[PDB]
Structures are given as structure tokens and as C-alpha cells.
Amino acid sequence: WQPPWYCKEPVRIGSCKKQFSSFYFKWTAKKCLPFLFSGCGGNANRFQTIGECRKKCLGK
């Protein structure tokens, strides 16, 4: 198994000024990890639930 491309993008908190609990795939550790998203200016390596992250990035 290899993850899709967006799971390999670096975590991006972005440029806005708020906080939203999120998950990203740290592909070098093959784990879905929590992070705080600012609310805009992110990238595609962001998921609302750890399950959605595992489904897309691990194929679970």
C-alpha cells in the first residue's frame, strides 16, 4: 500500500486566526495525527475525523 498524494503534503495550519481540531497524515510515520487548523489557507492533508484520515490515507 501507498497513500494518495494529498496524504503526503506537509501539515498546513494556514493563515487565518481561529482554531479547528483536525487530523493530518504524517506519511513518514504512517499515522493520522491531530492538529489545529486555523480555518483557511490549508492544503488537502486535513481531515475532520481520524477515521476519514485512516480511510483515505491508509485505505482502511
**Rounded to whole angstroms, how far apart are CA atoms 17 and 58?**
30
How far apart CA 18 and CA 16 sit, in angstroms, is 6
Q: Obtained via which technique? A: X-ray
Q: CB of 58 within 8 A of CB of 51?
A: no
Resolution (angstroms) equals 2.4
Q: What is the DSSP string of 1-60?
A: ----GGGGSPP---SSS--EEEEEEETTTTEEEEEEE-SSS--S--BSSHHHHIIIII--
Domains belonging to the chain, first-starting first, are 1-60 (4.10.410.10)
DSSP H helices in 1-60: 50-53
CA torsion angle for 60, 28, 11, 4 (degrees, to 10)? -50
